[PDB]
């Protein structure tokens, strides 16, 4: 099986319920990393480091707020998948909110590693709207709790922390998928990475990623297809094989201003 066969499936509308898994690869072409004081990169989402020095995380918060970055071809492709009534759900590891901006509604999304839309005082555990700390974060200040002075951390999943309970939508989405799209992740983080195994054995799995990662490398199924290389390139080659290149380009420079 090949990338052409997968494109033929979508075009025929044989794949009615597409489930997508995305990671950091799809947001790099918009200029998002993954000027800081980080001992190693992962420490930005680690609690022992965060409590020692919250500033590098809050630098990224200030960066990741709406406006600064734009969705790229990858996002807009997934927006076409929804527009044509083909997206069952999008599962994302990203915390940059670009899926929402591209036009994917909240109901078609699982922000599996959390969100800046709300926050919690790390000490007393009072909940905050994510706008209630905006001024502070923008003014290079560490947000503090009105009631106890503890650092107010955004609801981003740090290492060791449980994922939001919305993640449980995977129990009903994955068994129901007729096609799985893995785009721009090296499937390193658990339990997200494990979802690739949750689709039925007869289900096509399409990896559009830099390298052969996860279960596609270790225990490949017959209907798995890898389009290795740059993610943007890989997406465009599927878009072309679908006949959506014109519709895409119309969508992309429509969505700028």
């Amino acid at each position: 099986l090949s990338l052409q066969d997968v494109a033929e499936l979508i075009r025929a509308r044989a794949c009615q319920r597409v489930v997508v898994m995305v990671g950091a690869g799809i947001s790099t072409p918009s200029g998002i990393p993954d000027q800081y004081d980080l001992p190693y990169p992962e420490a930005i989402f680690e609690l022992p480091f965060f409590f020692h020095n919250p500033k590098p995380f809050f630098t990224l918060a200030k960066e990741l707020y709406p406006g600064n970055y734009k969705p790229n071809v990858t996002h807009y492709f997934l927006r076409l998948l929804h527009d044509k009534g083909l997206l069952l759900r999008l599962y994302t590891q990203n915390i940059d909110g670009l899926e929402r901006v591209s036009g994917i509604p909240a109901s078609k999304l699982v922000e599996a590693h959390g969100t800046f839309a709300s926050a919690t005082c790390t000490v007393c555990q009072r909940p905050f709207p994510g706008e209630d700390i905006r001024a502070d974060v923008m003014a290079d200040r560490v947000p503090r709790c009105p009631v106890c002075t503890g650092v107010v951390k955004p609801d981003i999943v740090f290492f060791g922390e449980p994922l939001p309970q919305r993640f449980l939508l995977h129990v009903v989405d994955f068994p129901m998928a007729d096609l799985l799209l893995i785009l721009g992740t090296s499937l390193e983080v658990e339990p997200f990475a494990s979802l690739t195994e949750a689709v039925r054995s007869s289900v096509p799995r399409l990896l559009i990623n830099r390298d052969l990662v996860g279960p596609l490398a270790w225990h490949p199924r017959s209907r798995d297809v890898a389009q290795l290389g740059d993610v943007v390139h890989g997406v465009e080659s599927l878009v072309e094989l679908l006949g959506w290149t014109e519709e895409m380009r119309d969508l992309v420079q429509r969505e700028t201003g």
Partner: peptide, 6 residues
Amino acid sequence: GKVMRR
């Protein structure tokens, strides 16, 4: 819990 493989 959110963990790396390695």
